[PDB]
Design a protein around this ligand. Sequence first.
Ligand SMILES: [Ca+2]
Ligand SMILES: [Cl-]
Ligand SMILES: [Cl-]
Ligand SMILES: [Cl-]
Ligand SMILES: [Cl-]
Length: 168
Amino acid sequence: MKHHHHHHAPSYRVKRMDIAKNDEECVVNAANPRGLPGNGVCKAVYKKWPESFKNSATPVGTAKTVMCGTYPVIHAVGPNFSNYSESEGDRELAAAYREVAKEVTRLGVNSVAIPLLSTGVYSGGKDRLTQSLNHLFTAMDSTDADVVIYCRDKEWEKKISEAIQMRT
Ligand SMILES: [Ca+2]
Ligand SMILES: [Cl-]
Ligand SMILES: [Cl-]
Ligand SMILES: [Cl-]
Ligand SMILES: [Cl-]
């Protein structure tokens, strides 16, 4: 059974920087179903933890953890909204985050670095910040890990921070 330090109060934070530089105990990749190096976040994850791509292929709506050494990389496959309808894509996006929460719990980590799934090249050309962040919260709220959300856009940083602060 998992125990924490007496001071542990689970938190959310957002940082605008490359998730490959994260200071957390594990990382969530914005993965593609075939386990390819990809682009954007996925390519940064591939450059930093290439060993974690051994047998990382997994279906849309799921997560698969592969260790790089002892450092866990949770490959979470959100839907490409160019291929899915809005209703089906929304369900798969929510499902991918639920699988992340299960993996974070199983691993026993105290913290996790997470990107906003399906907000980059899989967004179908739409702004999906609120949709993706709300599914992240829905899955992660019941976990006790410190969650650090990574983004790259300055306006997105502000909106994510606002959403975090308004629930506190
Ligand atoms: Ca699926
Ligand atoms: Cl950076
Ligand atoms: Cl892809
Ligand atoms: Cl994406
Ligand atoms: Cl961003």
